[PDB]
Amino acid sequence: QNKFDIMRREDRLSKGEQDLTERNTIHYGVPIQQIVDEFVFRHRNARGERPLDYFKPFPNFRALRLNRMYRDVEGFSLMKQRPEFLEWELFTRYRQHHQQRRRLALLHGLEPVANETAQERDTRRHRLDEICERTPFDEREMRVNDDEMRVSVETLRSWFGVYMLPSPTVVNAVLGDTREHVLSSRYLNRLLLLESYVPHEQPQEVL
Amino acid sequence: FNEFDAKGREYVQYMREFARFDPRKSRGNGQKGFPFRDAYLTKMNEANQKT
Amino acid sequence: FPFQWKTEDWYEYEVAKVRNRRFVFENTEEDGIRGSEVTYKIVLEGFWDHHVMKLAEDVCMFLKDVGRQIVEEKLVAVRRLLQGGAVDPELLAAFNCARAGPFGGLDEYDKEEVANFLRSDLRRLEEQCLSVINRCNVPVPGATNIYDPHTSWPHVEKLEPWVRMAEFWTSEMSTAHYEFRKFFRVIICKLPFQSTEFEKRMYDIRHWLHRQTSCEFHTIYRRNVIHDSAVFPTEHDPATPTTHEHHRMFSFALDWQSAPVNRLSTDTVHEGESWDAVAQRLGCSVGELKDANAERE
Amino acid sequence: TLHNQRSAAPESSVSQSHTVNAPTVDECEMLAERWGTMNYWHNDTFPRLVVFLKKLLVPDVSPLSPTAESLLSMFEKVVIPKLTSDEEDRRKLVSLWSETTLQAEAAVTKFLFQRGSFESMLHRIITDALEKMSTLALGGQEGNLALEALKRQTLFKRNDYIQKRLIDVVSNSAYLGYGDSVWQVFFAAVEANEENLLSDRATTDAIRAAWEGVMREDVVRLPDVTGVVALYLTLVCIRESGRLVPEELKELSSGLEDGVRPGVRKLQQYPLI
Amino acid sequence: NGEERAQEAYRWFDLALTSLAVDCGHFVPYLPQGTAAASHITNALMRTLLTCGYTHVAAIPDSVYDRMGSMGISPTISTYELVMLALSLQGNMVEAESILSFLRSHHSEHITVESFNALLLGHREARQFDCCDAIWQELVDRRWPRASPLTAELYLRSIMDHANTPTSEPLQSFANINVVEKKKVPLVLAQMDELGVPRTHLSRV
Amino acid sequence: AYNRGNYVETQDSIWEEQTASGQEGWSPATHADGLREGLPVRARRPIFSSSAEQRIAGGPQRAVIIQYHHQPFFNPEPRLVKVAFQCDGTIMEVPISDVMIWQRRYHGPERTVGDESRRYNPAAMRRYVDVTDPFNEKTSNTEHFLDKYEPKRNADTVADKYRTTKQITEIDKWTRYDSARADNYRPLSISHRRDYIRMGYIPRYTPWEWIAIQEADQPLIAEQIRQDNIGTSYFFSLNRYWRYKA
Amino acid sequence: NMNVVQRPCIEDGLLSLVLEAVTKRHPNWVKAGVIQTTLKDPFDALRWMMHIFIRLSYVPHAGAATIARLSRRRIGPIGLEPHQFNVPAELGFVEQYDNLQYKRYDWQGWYQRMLDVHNRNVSLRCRICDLQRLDGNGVQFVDMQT
Amino acid sequence: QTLQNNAVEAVGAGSAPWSILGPLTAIGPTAEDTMVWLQQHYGDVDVMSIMRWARFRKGKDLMAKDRPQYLARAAAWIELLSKRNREMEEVPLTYMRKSKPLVLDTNSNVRVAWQTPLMRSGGPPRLLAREEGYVFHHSNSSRFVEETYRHPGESLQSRYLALQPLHTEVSAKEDFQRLYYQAQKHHKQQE
Amino acid sequence: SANIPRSVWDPAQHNPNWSDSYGHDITNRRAWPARKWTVG
């Protein structure tokens, strides 16, 4: 009824925001838990979406939920829709490498902060790469899960190459003996460096 | 199996309570500040016990 | 070890442990699950033990989602109070109220020190509001233990059922033994602030309870009490002391007045009295007498 | 089919009361009146007491040359029979040089924690010296350069004093135990000297009553404090820890609280390799 | 006559700045922009432009604030409160909460109740009533600046606007759901009896 | 802005994005968060004074968790965590409330460990698990010295390995008890979307709409607010009018 | 020998300078008689540390009551006169309303009155350690003999 | 005195240009001019009724006996009840600058601040701030910055990297009174 | 605060570790064979 509200609605629609007159009624539309329960009820406990640990006698609460793709696969460049027989074990080894990197950063005060300037971020990342290249990779924390097999580091080094899973001699040779230390971001950056090298126009019928 | 049975879990908890008992920390706890009758009254009789 | 004691210490231990059963201070200024500001106990009663157990899963899930929403509403206010604020002049006047401080004389707190005492208390609100929120996000239906205070908020505590048996004839032929019984689960809600929004939401659980299942509410809250040293003064003993004859049967109604004793706050000035002579007769300072009588010069 | 209401993430359970973030430039501005905890001034990353002591430094001052050292060392008796030759001008110049040296020492010891007031007072001293120099010194304009050298030297002296005796003392926060071992040393020093601090002959009954009422609560939490008061507490605890530590560890030790408690189970006691 | 009174306010602002440049004839290149009179006249201009139509209300934090910055005039607390009220009438809540967060970070001893009234009115206009409850609970918690009867007016009107709001997720299967928020009204009134806000200082509607 | 080909740079940028948004970071630790050996932690350093009655808390320093007796009989109230601090290596026993872990999410029961992605199968209807060996007990990863004398027959080893191994389709059946299953959560309103198959569904949690209707129908008692700011009437309140008297 | 730090030696003049800066930062400490400027006794600097800690840690009863009324919403009156002490105390009481049979009918009044008068108990609790604070006159409220 | 204290505290003690020209005009030398000045500078309240109410204090006539006490009481009551006096006695605040998100998104709290040409001299004349994308953005952990990038040379880094965000931290506010005071100090203490 | 909390309906406040109502009771009614060994 007001000209103020009409001008505000036209301004908000020009900005590309939600009209306040569409907020006149409250919609508590479709919670995720009801959607998941309807999906499970429609698909008869949703087999195929459950992991293989769900069909084991003592599942954890993480095995009781359906399969989703989390933010672990977002960095892996070799990850496809269908991996070829050994890429998932390399991805799990890289994931455990980053988890040990997170543990080492929490140990030595190299965790990120909220107001981090990019120069402080690069300094903290360089110090974390300096302190993680001299720490050996812990294999006791490497936990095998739903379907993958237990693969040693030597099989992955023979198949994928020595550059994919490096030795300290290898990272000293690329940035400048078979043992595994925690991966660093500057070494993978050097590896990627070496691998890369009229308004209101009208149609013809109205014309 | 587990480590202890039902009465064994009870009396191992009473020894952990008396190992960290401090009477000034029993300020307003009520009867939960009473420090395991068996081991507490044993200490009060050391003038008679004399190992 | 082995435990051998005097019997007089064991006689004194066993009476002291039962008499001090409810001599407990619930709302203490402390860390997590022990310490709080208000304590709510909702005693649920029903005729079957699985009826009260299924209700205590229905109410604890209700008070978890409600209580997390209210504490998040208090946590979003406490984190604004910690970013910055202006000191209340009535709060500053409360610190500078005593005549003599701990260091002798008037302790003049500025706006820096009073905002420091307010910041150190609001830092305790954040550590206690995060303790309730973290225990409200733990009980997933995959792994749920609502009977442990370290795991869930609120937790359920067991109570002994009320059981009363009857001995009556089935005829002088035989005696029947039937027992009335009802079962109890109590729900302990410990909040580190007083919220009337939560007390309103707690009282309306009685309108959607289960069949033949009722409840009662317990509330232990902190409340400031003033001991007025002028209404209840600390005086000497009288010259003629009281005896046992003032404490006979029916001396509670005919010998003693109710506390407190009325003391006269008005007086009349005599013939040769001055400002220093009335204050001597009333036992007060001369400047204190003129402040109560600022109308008359 | 979605919701028209405002979608918002749940409020963060990360404790912002104990989260010490990166220091902003407005925080370094208002650090002179900032109330912080002992963890805040002696933080493991970004300690704020070092930032508070580093904003007292006079910037862009440098140690002067050994030529300027040889100039400023001998001005009382070799250059003073060159600017003038008569008795009263020599007497005036001797008195002015001695008074300017005395007030430069007073300036470098007086305003140690106020940089702007020290700078303004030193500028006023240098101008009031230069004007009375320009009255009777003339001699080819030599004394004004020797007073600019003294202006450089006195500005270097305070910046070296607050570096060596304040910044390099409170530098290693891990040696100080991130402020908590400072409080441990303070409580142990009170634990050693109850007869001198809290007695019937030491303090009044109100002080003892307030001290007992502080230390009888459910959790005794340490108060947040101002940066100059934090520096005071740190320096007195550094001085007082020498008496509580046994004689083998008085000079060289690992940590401020090292040997203060009688029996401590350390993690570095087993791995000698 | 929103646009005409806005043009007259801009013309009188230009007249005022010319007379302030006359009346100030060291700090010579920084006059009269550094004086209290320029900030007072700019606050008067913002307070008058709030009265006008939506274009000038939207131009208060857009054009007027940028012009006050480019002229070099130091603002006061009424400047930020009128900018917050203009953003409140626009419906932009993240910028108004950003301005109050700026005031909480830097100049916290100068904040008056008009900023809280601006946020209450704006979250009432943006129909985010949970933020209205959060702001009212924060104002009851800190107790300073003191709650005017305009605070109780805006909060109770936000409660009555939320309680009369129909919902569409149960599709009115049994009854109206939001009426239970009127149960918050006997609580908050009691809070007014603790806040010293007289309930007779409420409008008749 | 980050290198998508780099894995560590991408995961570090994800970590910094979730740290800036407040999702990850130092939060007070629950008992359910998985406090185990080798855990980095921020624990408040306890201060010891003989004049202190209960205890003195201090600033949160970084430490490792050496051990944590999660059993309620090995660790009564208040619970203790054995930690070793970063600065001096001092092993102490701190309370569990003075313990802060680096959470990775808001809603977690175990906020310490991160989420892990599961493998994908296109035709996931066929997947074979040994019923006798669900976690593969009887297989030996290491080569023993006695396998030279074990029988080298092949068919008898594959026969039992394919006999008791069952597909996941015939492990469990969707009965009529699953159709009438009650929700583990409290629903918003009772949904008639799936009401053709359920046939006897009774909820174990009353929905939010029904709670709101039961709350909106009954009034409040004005004396439940129990506000008090004056004090107690020491002279009059017990001597009031006779109909309303104490 | 590499992971050891030489203990720095602090002279009394540097302590006097930092104490002068502390007094100039907080003049109301010297005005209220908390700290001094002098360093005559050898235990003076530790005494001023103890006084600073007592001032920054001890909360008076009226100020603590006002802070508890502010954010924790503790109800009750607050006395600012020196003859009024603030006692933080707990109050326990029972609320009971029937909802099964005695929810409503002509019996509901006397049954609700029976439930109310049966729940007439009010438990008022106070720690004696909370009573051992300083009064408005500077003397402690409850001492040992009290 | 209040305006002089505001201009002193705006810098931190010298005076600011805040107290050069305040909102009060001079009083005319007439009692009618006095009534004019009180009606045009405190006209939201009834000044004469306030001065009549402030006359007596606990029965004592202050206007006939304690004259400066009555003047201080009436001035305090007029300054309290008047809203225009409350709006004209405000402390000068710093200027809150707008900000935009970063081009290379490193943090959600790190933002590129909008800088006044008074702060940085030179450069091109700019447009309005909202068109480029500058809004009011501030929180508890907000940090403001100027964002450039390190200049790429003809080397191994050509396209694989996102041209790393070299940052330079700026302030969140523009203290105009302190800038004017420091500029006048550089115009005065240098000479 | 609101009558129905934000954790119910808002997808940004959804618990990621929450599991459906049907899987746990189907897991709990599984019958596993006891005899895994040859002798005992």
Please give the full DSSP string across C37-56, using - where no structure is assigned.
Answer: SEEEEEEEEESSHHHHHHHH
CA pair distance D63, G143, nearest whole angstrom? 62
Torsion angle, alpha carbons of E7, E13, E15, E20, to 10: 180
Q: Do residues F38 and F57 touch, judged by C-beta distance below 8 A? A: no
d(CA A132, CA A100): 9
Contact yes or no for E186 and F222 at CB 8 A: yes
d(C-alpha F38, C-alpha A40), whole Å: 39
Q: Do E106 and D26 touch (CB under 8 A)?
A: yes
Which value in Å is the resolution of this experimental model?
Answer: 3.1
Q: Do chains A and I touch (3 or more CB pairs under 8 A)?
A: yes
- Could you say which of D14, D218, D219 has the minimum Cβ distance to residue F25? D14
- Long-range CB pairs of B35-38 (<8 Å, 24+ gap) are B37/C10, B37/C13, B37/C14, B37/C17, B38/B14, B38/C3
Chain F positions touching H105 (Cβ under 8 A) are 1
Three-state DSSP class for A84?
A: coil
Element (H, E) at D30: helix D25-30
C81 alpha-carbon distance from chain centroid:
26
Cβ contact E177–I2 (<8 Å):
no
Q: Which stretches of chain E sit within 8 Å of chain A by CB?
A: 53-55, 58, 89-91, 125-127, 165-169, 178
- Helix ranges (H only) for chain F are 7-20, 155-163, 176-179, 208-216
Q: Do chains E and F touch (3 or more CB pairs under 8 A)?
A: yes
Determine the Cα–Cα distance for residues F90 and F68; give it in Å rounded to an integer. Answer: 16
Q: Do D22 and A120 touch (CB under 8 A)?
A: yes
Under a CB-based contact definition with an 8 Å cutoff, are residues A192 and H162 in contact? Answer: no
Is I37 touching F (CB cutoff 8 A)? no
Task: Identify the CA nearest to C83 among candidates H140, E141, D15.
Answer: H140
How do beta strands H143-147 and H110-113 pair? parallel
What is the rounded CA–CA span in Å between residue F152 and residue F168?
A: 31
Ranges of beta strands (E only) in chain D are: 35-36, 225-226, 252-253
Q: Note whether H touches G: 3 CB pairs or more under 8 A.
A: no
> What is the torsional sign of CA C188, C193, C194, C200?
negative
Nearest Cα of chain F lies from the Cα of C196 at a distance, in angstroms, of 7
Of H142, A7, H113, the residue nearest E91 (C-alpha): A7
Rounded CA-CA distance I19/A53 in Å is 14
Which residues of chain G are within 8 Å of residue B28 when distances are taken between CB atoms? 127
Residue C297 touches chain H, beta carbons under 8 Å: yes
Do G115 and G98 form a contact (C-beta atoms < 8 A)? yes
Q: Which helix (H) or strand (E) holds G108?
A: helix G108-118
Residue of D18, D215, D257 lying closest to F52 (CB–CB): D215
Q: Which residues contact A42 (CB under 8 A, 6 or more apart)?
A: F194
F235 has a chain C CB within 8 A of its CB: yes
Nearest alpha-carbon partner for F108 in G140, A60, A51, C212: A60
How many angstroms away from the CA of G107 is the closest CA of chain D?
Answer: 47
CA distance D51 to chain C (A): 21
Contacting subunits of I (3+ beta carbon pairs below 8 A): A, C, D, E, F
> For residue B8, what are the contacts with CB-CB under 8 A and spacing of at least 6?
none
Using CA atoms, how far apart are residues G7 and D245, in angstroms rounded to an integer? 11
Q: In which element (H, E) is residue E42 found?
A: helix E36-49
Beta carbons of C85 and E110 less than 8 Å apart:
no
Which chain G residues have a beta carbon less than 8 Å from that of E143?
70
User: d(Cα A41, Cα A18) in Å, to the nearest integer?
Assistant: 35
From its phi and psi, is residue C111 left (phi > 0), alpha (psi between -120 and 50) or beta? alpha
* Chain H nearest-CA residue for C295: H58
Neighbours of chain E (3+ CB pairs under 8 A): A, C, D, F, G, H, I
- Partners of residue G95 in chain F, C-beta under 8 Å: 224
Touching status, chains B and H (3+ beta-carbon pairs under 8 Å)? no
Tokens for A157? 């080094």
- DSSP 8-class letter at E66: H
Taken as a whole, chain I contains a residue count of 40
* Residues in chain C preceding a C-to-N separation beyond 2.5 angstroms (breaks): 171
The edge-to-edge listing of strands for the beta sheet with C155-169 is: C155-169, C175-191, C38-46, C214-228, G84-96, G123-125
The full length of chain D comes to 273
How many pairs of residues across C and F have Cβ atoms under 8 Å apart?
77
Other C-beta atoms lying within 10 Å of the C-beta of residue I29:
12
3-state secondary structure of G118: helix
Residues of chain H with C-beta less than 8 angstroms from the C-beta of C79: 140
Count the neighbouring beta carbons within 10 Å of the beta carbon of residue H76. 11
* DSSP-H helix ranges across chain H: 2-11, 31-41, 47-53, 62-65, 67-81, 83-88, 129-132, 176-188
Beta bridge partners of F128: F167
Experiment used for this model? cryo-EM
CB E38 within 8 A of CB E32: yes
Residue whose entry in the numeric block shows the structure tokens 């009375």: D132
Sequential DSSP letters for F70-117: -STTTS-SSPEEEEEETTT-BEEEEEGGGEEEEES-SS-SS-SSPP-P
Tokens of I10: 């808002």
Chains with 3 or more CB pairs under 8 A to chain H: A, C, D, E, F
Within 10 Å of residue F59's Cβ, how many Cβ atoms?
26
- Asked if H92 lies within 8 A of E31 by C-beta distance, the reply is no
Q: Chain E closest CA to C136's CA: distance in Å?
A: 20
Q: Which residue of I1, I7, I13 is the best one to mutate when testing the E interface, meaning the one whose CB has the most E CBs within 10 A? A: I1
I14 touches chain A (CB under 8 A): yes
Q: Please tell me if residue H145 touches chain A, with a CB cutoff of 8 Å.
A: yes
Q: Alpha-carbon Rg of chain H, whole angstroms?
A: 26
| A39: three-class secondary structure by DSSP | helix
**Of C144, C87, C95, whose CA–CA distance to C111 is shortest?**
C87
CB D183 within 8 A of CB D222: yes
Nearest to C126 by CA among C192, C38, C175: C192
Partner-chain contact F238 C208, CB within 8 Å: no
Per the CB < 8 A criterion, the answer to whether H37 and H28 are in contact is yes
Q: How far apart are CA H70 and CA H48, in angstroms?
A: 14
User: Across the B/F interface, how many CB contacts are shorter than 8 Å?
Assistant: 23
In terms of Cα–Cα distance, which of D198, D192, D221 is closest to D210? D198
Question: Rounded distance, CA D36 to CA E146, Å?
Answer: 28
Do I18 and A33 meet the contact criterion of CB atoms below 8 Å apart? yes
Check if F215 contacts G (Cβ < 8 Å): no
CA-to-CA distance for H16 and E39, rounded, in angstroms?
14
Helix axes H176-188, H2-11, angle to 10 degrees: 80
Of A41, A42, A74, the CB nearest to F14: A74
Q: Which amino acid is at B47?
A: A
CB contacts, 8 Å: F73 with chain B = 4, 9-10, 12-13, 16
d(CA E120, CA E111): 15
